[PDB]
Design a protein around this ligand. Structure first.
Ligand SMILES: *[C@@H]1O[C@H](CO)[C@@H](O[C@@H]2O[C@H](CO)[C@@H](O[C@@H]3O[C@H](CO[C@H]4O[C@H](CO[C@H]5O[C@H](CO)[C@@H](O)[C@H](O)[C@@H]5O)[C@@H](O)[C@H](O[C@H]5O[C@H](CO)[C@@H](O)[C@H](O)[C@@H]5O[C@H]5O[C@H](CO)[C@@H](O)[C@H](O)[C@@H]5O)[C@@H]4O)[C@@H](O)[C@H](O[C@H]4O[C@H](CO)[C@@H](O)[C@H](O)[C@@H]4O[C@H]4O[C@H](CO)[C@@H](O)[C@H](O)[C@@H]4O[C@H]4O[C@H](CO)[C@@H](O)[C@H](O)[C@@H]4O)[C@@H]3O)[C@H](O)[C@H]2NC(C)=O)[C@H](O)[C@H]1NC(C)=O
Ligand SMILES: *[C@@H]1O[C@H](CO)[C@@H](O[C@@H]2O[C@H](CO)[C@@H](O[C@@H]3O[C@H](CO[C@H]4O[C@H](CO[C@H]5O[C@H](CO)[C@@H](O)[C@H](O)[C@@H]5O)[C@@H](O)[C@H](O[C@H]5O[C@H](CO)[C@@H](O)[C@H](O)[C@@H]5O)[C@@H]4O)[C@@H](O)[C@H](O[C@H]4O[C@H](CO)[C@@H](O)[C@H](O)[C@@H]4O[C@H]4O[C@H](CO)[C@@H](O)[C@H](O)[C@@H]4O[C@H]4O[C@H](CO)[C@@H](O)[C@H](O)[C@@H]4O)[C@@H]3O)[C@H](O)[C@H]2NC(C)=O)[C@H](O)[C@H]1NC(C)=O
Ligand SMILES: *[C@@H]1O[C@H](CO)[C@@H](O[C@@H]2O[C@H](CO)[C@@H](O[C@@H]3O[C@H](CO[C@H]4O[C@H](CO[C@H]5O[C@H](CO)[C@@H](O)[C@H](O)[C@@H]5O)[C@@H](O)[C@H](O)[C@@H]4O)[C@@H](O)[C@H](O[C@H]4O[C@H](CO)[C@@H](O)[C@H](O)[C@@H]4O[C@H]4O[C@H](CO)[C@@H](O)[C@H](O)[C@@H]4O)[C@@H]3O)[C@H](O)[C@H]2NC(C)=O)[C@H](O)[C@H]1NC(C)=O
Ligand SMILES: *[C@@H]1O[C@H](CO)[C@@H](O[C@@H]2O[C@H](CO)[C@@H](O[C@@H]3O[C@H](CO[C@H]4O[C@H](CO[C@H]5O[C@H](CO)[C@@H](O)[C@H](O)[C@@H]5O)[C@@H](O)[C@H](O[C@H]5O[C@H](CO)[C@@H](O)[C@H](O)[C@@H]5O[C@H]5O[C@H](CO)[C@@H](O)[C@H](O)[C@@H]5O)[C@@H]4O)[C@@H](O)[C@H](O)[C@@H]3O)[C@H](O)[C@H]2NC(C)=O)[C@H](O)[C@H]1NC(C)=O
Ligand SMILES: *[C@@H]1O[C@H](CO)[C@@H](O[C@@H]2O[C@H](CO)[C@@H](O[C@@H]3O[C@H](CO[C@H]4O[C@H](CO[C@H]5O[C@H](CO)[C@@H](O)[C@H](O)[C@@H]5O[C@H]5O[C@H](CO)[C@@H](O)[C@H](O)[C@@H]5O)[C@@H](O)[C@H](O[C@H]5O[C@H](CO)[C@@H](O)[C@H](O)[C@@H]5O)[C@@H]4O)[C@@H](O)[C@H](O)[C@@H]3O)[C@H](O)[C@H]2NC(C)=O)[C@H](O)[C@H]1NC(C)=O
Ligand SMILES: *[C@@H]1O[C@H](CO)[C@@H](O[C@@H]2O[C@H](CO)[C@@H](O[C@@H]3O[C@H](CO)[C@@H](O)[C@H](O[C@H]4O[C@H](CO)[C@@H](O)[C@H](O)[C@@H]4O)[C@@H]3O)[C@H](O)[C@H]2NC(C)=O)[C@H](O)[C@H]1NC(C)=O
Ligand SMILES: *[C@@H]1O[C@H](CO)[C@@H](O)[C@H](O)[C@H]1NC(C)=O
Lengths: 210, 228, 96, 53
């Protein structure tokens, strides 16, 4: 389910999952931080292993005609993740693929402007008749940004390969961009520029040949 | 302390068998019920099957005809073997202990109970790619840090197949300010990334800096000194 | 006890009205029902072909209300007021 | 007890009459049974045998 509830800090999140119940179920929950192994959250329906606080709680698998609801009380920053279900119903057979990745997102984040660090083709790379420019964009919120390249006040059409902002371990995001050239193009223009958008505030770094 | 880690090949052609392994540490391999899990990028985790020392070994119904699991007392691992792979099989494969419980709802005397499993602590994750194309090791070039008391510095890794690549700064000694950026899949079907650190201007005394790069699928090991 | 004691069955019937053959689905017990020929997906009610089944109205109740047999006039009903009576034979503590 | 929580379903064969059946089962599916103390029962069987003898 492409679903995502949005909550404020010190407020309650109702993140439901799975189809509706039939018999007595036992629904194990999981948490998935971006790029990390899914830590276990709850078993069977409300008890939890070591490390999980009392903020976490789930639907008692003892009612029929009810989805699995996971409650996160007074949410904070770190609670942001992709949550899943492992549904074990008495009448419906074994679930080998997990539930829906309900994405919990908090509402009160400080907007953050990025940290661009432009880099020219290294002296070593040009020894092999190849040129590549790099624009590393770090720690910004939210994760959406339009990168623009300019060769001395002139838009660069191709050779540009911008990534998609992948989430940092913190609430921030981080993305990267490359401008492939030829050495001849590189030392031709007096400078190349990497304009980047917050989005909202444009900002640029500029690098020149020596 | 108890933990574990798994390993793999990274890339495999459509034919042949995907073989994996999973080290164990802190507890014995017999005592636990073991389970392998795979998850594609973005998609939900998919239980593959479980296993115990006795040979008590059942699989996912879908992939049942292909998957073949096993253990070992000597090496103490979890040995998966997925035969007849496919593009769809490209995913990251996790290793995890499993704890079991009884869920009696009716009367234990005549069944009326179901037995459920949950996996308490996972591995790190092993990447798998299923592509026709063959492997390339990266081309590694260092960046140019310079041009008061603040500064930044980096290292560029490019043109390789498949993901992932490992990068550690100065043999893992340096850590603060290190920000390895995600790769980019170039139009010619090759990934490329970079790593970057922030060191202040205090760096006259030949501050040895070396970005160690490891692309296991091509067994290549490249390290490079960055100096203005 | 997992041979199929509760069974989910379908069948076509004409409603209150002869202008609707409604394919209806209902539940039955393995005893209450009996198969035909090869065990296909087909069954028939346990005694439908050989008997007349009558649905007892739900309004009625089978609760066992106690009952006394009051005797008519010019007659009498006697009792054995003994503790341990054989069932057959002479009584001693008798009453009307 | 019959542990199952059943739902009534009136299918009207008509005209002014319907045939009721279980529409569904709200919850788990279970078996009917009867509980009796085996101590009480077999100590009762002791009462019987001596008067059977
Ligand atoms: C004829 O004769 C037959 C045979 O004799 C008889 O058959 C019996 O039928 C009954 C039902 O008709 C059936 O009862 C079920 O029993 C299930 C198993 O219970 C036993 O095991 C558990 C688990 O054991 C493990 O864990 C223990 C630690 O807790 C550990 O000690 C064990 O070693 C083992 O590792 C055990 O916890 C139970 O002990 C509780 O129950 C005893 C009574 O049996 C009681 O004396 C104990 O004190 C203890 O009570 C505590 O817990 C209850 C809550 O469970 C509290 O209310 C008390 O105040 C105490 O704190 C048993 O030893 C059991 O799982 C079933 O109950 C769950 O399932 C039904 C539906 O499946 C639900 O409706 C229930 O509400 C309940 O659901 C809760 O628990 C499950 C899983 O635990 C969760 O998934 C649910 O979400 C829910 O949990 C939530 O709510 C609770 C509060 O309710 C809360 O605490 C949680 O945090 C959470 O928020 C059900 O009771 C029995 O198995 C069956 N067979 C036998 C042999 O008895 C017939 O009945 C007879 N018929 C007639 C007509 O006489
Ligand atoms: C004996 O055998 C017989 C023979 O089969 C059995 O007979 C069956 O009996 C049952 C009930 O006893 C009948 O019920 C049907 O239920 C389904 C339920 O749909 C669910 O599944 C959908 C698909 O699931 C997918 O995903 C799951 C995993 O999650 C997977 O397992 C599955 O394979 C599949 O891949 C879901 O999409 C659906 O969820 C939807 O709604 C959620 C909110 O509740 C929402 O969160 C979801 O995102 C999603 O949007 C649900 O969970 C019904 O589909 C079916 O009929 C509906 O659909 C048809 C079209 O196909 C439509 O014409 C019907 O009118 C009806 O649609 C309305 O009713 C639904 C609820 O009944 C409702 O969910 C719909 O949204 C829709 O709602 C409309 O009406 C309501 C008022 O009622 C109104 O408020 C709304 O605004 C809207 O206007 C039935 O309901 C079977 O039909 C029946 N089969 C046959 C062949 O007779 C019998 O059960 C057996 N006996 C026993 C004891 O087992
Ligand atoms: C007809 O039905 C009857 C009923 O089932 C059958 O006879 C039954 O047989 C049972 C044994 O199989 C027997 O149970 C034993 O009872 C003894 C005494 O019972 C009372 O006391 C115990 C303990 O309570 C104590 O503690 C409290 C405080 O907590 C005090 O207040 C008490 O005064 C006591 O001091 C209670 O549990 C009971 O409910 C009664 O109150 C017990 O001694 C006995 O325990 C063990 O020791 C016995 C030897 O001393 C031994 O014979 C018995 O087998 C027990 O052995 C234990 O250890 C072994 C090995 O580890 C283990 O395998 C066992 O499972 C057990 O744990 C039992 O509790 C019933 O009392 C008895 N009932 C009747 C009415 O006679 C009869 O067979 C059957 N007939 C037929 C033909 O089927
Ligand atoms: C009341 O309740 C009933 C039960 O719930 C409901 O019954 C349903 O009724 C509908 C019709 O209203 C059915 O749909 C029709 O199905 C027809 C299937 O016919 C097949 O069987 C014929 C005879 O049976 C032979 O074959 C079976 C195979 O299982 C054997 O078991 C038998 O012993 C016997 O041997 C057969 O004559 C028929 O014809 C095909 O084969 C011959 C021979 O080769 C060909 O010459 C012919 O051309 C047919 O083949 C071609 O045509 C069919 C057309 O559909 C193609 O599929 C086929 O691939 C090929 O191209 C065939 O073998 C079908 O012909 C009809 O067109 C309808 O589709 C439901 O099947 C039936 N079941 C259920 C559960 O619904 C009823 O609906 C319900 N009514 C109310 C009031 O709701
Ligand atoms: C619809 O459903 C009905 C009812 O379910 C079916 O009705 C049957 O209809 C067929 C029609 O042909 C009748 O078959 C006859 O079978 C005669 C031989 O039967 C002998 O072998 C049987 C094999 O069963 C064994 O194996 C299964 C698993 O494979 C076990 O579950 C089962 O318990 C048996 O295991 C024992 O035996 C094996 C060796 O075979 C050992 O290795 C094991 O360790 C076990 O010891 C067997 O079941 C038969 O038992 C019957 O007879 C003995 C007396 O000899 C009696 O004591 C038993 O209680 C039981 O009644 C038997 O040994 C064959 O000779 C004859 O020609 C005919 O084919 C069958 O009798 C019908 N059954 C009933 C109950 O009526 C119907 O088939 C089905 N239809 C469809 C389309 O699905
Ligand atoms: C032959 O059979 C008859 C009939 O069974 C039998 O007579 C019965 O005797 C008993 C007493 O032995 C009577 O029981 C009494 O009933 C009256 C009401 O009918 C009660 O008031 C009595 O209660 C007394 O005891 C209580 C105990 O605490 C007190 O609370 C109370 O205040 C009273 O003191 C008592 O229950 C019984 O009614 C009669 N039955 C009839 C029909 O008369 C007779 O004994 C048998 N004879 C032989 C030789 O077997
Ligand atoms: C598992 O750990 C052992 C050391 O105990 C090591 O020899 C082995 O190579 C490891 N396996 C993998 C796949 O790294």
């Amino acid at each position: 389910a492409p679903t995502f509830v949005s909550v404020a800090p010190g407020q309650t999140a109702r993140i439901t999952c799975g189809e509706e119940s039939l018999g007595s179920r036992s629904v194990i929950w999981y948490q998935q931080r971006p790029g990390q192994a899914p830590s276990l959250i709850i078993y069977n329906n409300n008890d939890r292993p070591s490390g999980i606080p009392d903020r976490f709680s789930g639907s008692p698998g003892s009612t029929f005609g009810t989805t699995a609801t996971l409650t996160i009380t007074s949410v904070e920053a770190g609670d942001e993740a992709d949550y899943y279900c492992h549904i074990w119903d008495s009448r419906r057979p074994t679930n080998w693929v997990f539930g829906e990745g309900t994405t919990l997102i908090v509402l009160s984040q400080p907007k953050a402007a990025p940290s661009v660090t432009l880099f020219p083709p290294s002296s070593e790379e040009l020894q092999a008749n190849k040129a590549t420019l790099v624009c590393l964009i770090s720690d910004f919120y939210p994760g959406a940004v339009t990168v623009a390249w300019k060769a001395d006040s002139s838009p660069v059409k191709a050779g540009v390969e911008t990534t998609t902002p992948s989430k940092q371990s913190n609430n921030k995001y981080a993305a990267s961009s490359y401008l492939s050239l030829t050495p001849e193009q590189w030392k031709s223009h007096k400078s190349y520029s990497c304009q980047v958008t917050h989005e909202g505030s444009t900002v640029e770094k500029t690098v020149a040949p020596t | 302390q108890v933990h574990l880690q798994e390993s793999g090949p990274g890339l495999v052609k459509p034919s042949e068998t995907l073989s994996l392994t999973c080290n164990v540490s802190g507890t014995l391999v017999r005592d636990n019920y073991w389970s392998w899990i795979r998850q594609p990028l973005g998609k939900q985790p998919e239980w593959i099957g479980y296993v115990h020392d006795s040979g008590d070994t059942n699989y996912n119904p879908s992939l049942k005809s292909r998957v073949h699991l096993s253990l070992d007392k000597s090496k103490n691992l979890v040995s998966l073997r997925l035969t007849g792979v496919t593009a769809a099989d490209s995913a990251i494969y996790y290793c995890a202990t499993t704890k079991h419980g009884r869920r009696i709802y009716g009367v234990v005397a005549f069944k009326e109970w179901f037995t459920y499993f949950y996996m308490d602590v996972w591995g790190k994750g092993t990447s798998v790619t299923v592509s026709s194309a063959s492997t390339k090791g990266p081309s590694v070039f260092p960046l140019a840090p310079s041009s008061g008391g603040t500064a930044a510095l980096g290292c560029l890794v490019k043109d390789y197949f498949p993901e992932p690549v490992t990068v550690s700064w100065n043999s893992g000694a340096l850590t603060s300010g290190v920000h390895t950026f995600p790769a980019v899949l170039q139009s010619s079907g090759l990934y490329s990334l970079s790593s970057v650190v922030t060191v202040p201007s205090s760096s006259l005394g030949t501050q040895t800096y070396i970005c160690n790069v490891n692309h296991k699928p091509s067994n290549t090991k490249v390290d490079k000194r960055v100096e203005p | 006890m997992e041979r199929g004691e509760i069974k989910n069955c379908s069948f076509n019937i004409t409603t209150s009205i002869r202008d609707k053959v409604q394919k209806e689905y209902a539940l039955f017990y393995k005893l209450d029902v009996v198969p035909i020929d090869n065990n296909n997906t087909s069954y028939r009610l346990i005694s439908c072909d050989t008997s007349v089944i009558t649905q007892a109205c739900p309004k009625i109740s089978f609760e066992p209300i106690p009952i006394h047999y009051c005797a008519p006039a010019g007659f009498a009903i006697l009792k054995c007021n003994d503790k341990t009576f054989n069932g057959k034979g002479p009584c001693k503590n008798v009453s009307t | 007890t019959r542990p199952n929580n059943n739902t009534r379903k009136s299918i009207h064969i008509g005209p002014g009459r319907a045939f009721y059946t279980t529409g569904e089962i709200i919850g788990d599916i279970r078996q009917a049974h009867c509980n009796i103390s085996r101590a009480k029962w077999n100590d009762t069987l002791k009462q019987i045998v001596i008067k059977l003898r």
